[PDB]
Amino acid sequence: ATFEIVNRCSYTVWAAASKGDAALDAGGRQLNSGESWTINVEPGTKGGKIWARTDCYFDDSGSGICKTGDCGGLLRCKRFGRPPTTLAEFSLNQYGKDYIDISNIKGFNVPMDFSPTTRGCRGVRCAADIVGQCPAKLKAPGGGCNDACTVFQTSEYCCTTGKCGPTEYSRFFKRLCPDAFSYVLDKPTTVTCPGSSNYRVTFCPTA
């Protein structure tokens, strides 16, 4: 499957793509404002994620740091990124269908649209100014808006027991972005697409 990753932000981002225990494609790349990077993701990929990283520095070997979404200091991510990270999430070719969503469960750093480029389903978007409107207690000094689990480490926010409800914090993310997961047991906003669809992830789709 192809994913075209497009940076419409006025700032550089370092895109990342991983399934948690391995890179997808090269795993990461710099995208200046306006740049597009197309990656190939193997059919059947389960639990894949794409995200943006901000304010990164890498040496000539591809080792460094990002202020949001850092994946063990690598340019080419093999693992998931450090919150806060707006997440484009997907599982492909699962009994004949693809499943896509956007999640704020690990916080929000950069606005995103995640849409099919092929027929048969709709896209999802979280493009509100979540960083600007972020509750004081969730603001990440390093940049972005943390989820409450990251900040407070409670069973209720982290849904550790599989028994949690919505919270004042989850409701903030849900109010700003109804079409993204705001906590683990949120009413799903997952979209079912034809198996083997192709996609575009656009950072800063509205600005």
UniProtKB/Swiss-Prot annotation:
It is found in: Cytoplasmic vesicle. Pfam families: Thaumatin (PF00314). Coiled coil: none annotated. InterPro entries: Osmotin/thaumatin-like_sf (IPR037176), Thaumatin (IPR001938), Thaumatin_CS (IPR017949). SMART domains: THN (SM00205). The keyword Protease does not apply. GO terms for cellular component: cytoplasmic vesicle. The keyword Signal applies. Disulfide bonds join 9-204, 56-66, 71-77, 121-193, 126-177, 134-145, 149-158, 159-164. Keywords: Cytoplasmic vesicle, Disulfide bond, Signal, Taste-modifying protein. Belongs to the thaumatin family. Taste-modifying protein; intensely sweet-tasting. It is 100000 times sweeter than sucrose on a molar basis. This is Thaumatin I. It comes from Thaumatococcus daniellii (Katemfe).
